[PDB]
Amino acid sequence: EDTEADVPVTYGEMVLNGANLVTALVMGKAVRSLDDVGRHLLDMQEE
Amino acid sequence: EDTEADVPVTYGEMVLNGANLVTALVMGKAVRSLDDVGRHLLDMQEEQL
């Protein structure tokens, strides 16, 4: 028994905050973390 | 009653903007002027009636 105590965490949540509210409704698809993926896709082509 | 005045430009440039780029190639859909209607469905979201 290395110790008798451990370090867990709490829930991380995933809510339709911004653009995912439009894309779920105006479009169909609602790809997760589209606030970050859209930021990464708009950073690559302009160099 | 001749010599009318006309518009010279081909009216509009529907180009893939920052909203229509990320919507088209990822979500497989597009909307004409999602820049506008993405703001209007959220503007009447806070205050409606």
UniProtKB/Swiss-Prot annotation, chain A:
Position of the signal peptide: none
Its annotated compartments are: Virion; Host nucleus
Write out the similarity annotation: Belongs to the herpesviridae major capsid protein family.
Q: What task does this protein carry out?
A: Self-assembles to form an icosahedral capsid with a T=16 symmetry, about 200 nm in diameter, and consisting of 150 hexons and 12 pentons (total of 162 capsomers). Hexons form the edges and faces of the capsid and are each composed of six MCP molecules. In contrast, one penton is found at each of the 12 vertices. Eleven of the pentons are MCP pentamers, while the last vertex is occupied by the portal complex.
What is the annotated quaternary arrangement, including any partners?
Homomultimer. Makes the hexons and eleven out of twelve pentons. Interacts with triplex proteins 1/TRX1 and 2/TRX2; adjacent capsomers are linked together in groups of three by triplexes, heterotrimeric complexes composed of one molecule of TRX1 and two molecules of TRX2. Interacts with scaffold protein; this interaction allows efficient MCP transport to the host nucleus. Interacts with capsid vertex component 2/CVC2. Interacts with the small capsomere-interacting protein/SCP.
| Name by which UniProt lists this protein | Major capsid protein
Q: Which organism is it from?
A: Human herpesvirus 2 (strain HG52) (HHV-2)
| Gene (name only) | MCP
Entire-sequence positions represented here:
296 to 342 of 1374
Swiss-Prot record, chain B:
Query: What S-S linkages are listed for this chain?
Result: none
Coiled-coil regions listed in the entry:
none
Where does this protein reside within or beyond the cell?
Virion; Host nucleus
State the oligomer form and interacting partners: Homomultimer. Makes the hexons and eleven out of twelve pentons. Interacts with triplex proteins 1/TRX1 and 2/TRX2; adjacent capsomers are linked together in groups of three by triplexes, heterotrimeric complexes composed of one molecule of TRX1 and two molecules of TRX2. Interacts with scaffold protein; this interaction allows efficient MCP transport to the host nucleus. Interacts with capsid vertex component 2/CVC2. Interacts with the small capsomere-interacting protein/SCP.
The record's comment on protein family reads: Belongs to the herpesviridae major capsid protein family.
Role noted for this protein: Self-assembles to form an icosahedral capsid with a T=16 symmetry, about 200 nm in diameter, and consisting of 150 hexons and 12 pentons (total of 162 capsomers). Hexons form the edges and faces of the capsid and are each composed of six MCP molecules. In contrast, one penton is found at each of the 12 vertices. Eleven of the pentons are MCP pentamers, while the last vertex is occupied by the portal complex.
Task: Specify the protein name.
Answer: Major capsid protein
Q: Which organism is it from?
A: Human herpesvirus 2 (strain HG52) (HHV-2)
| Annotated gene | MCP
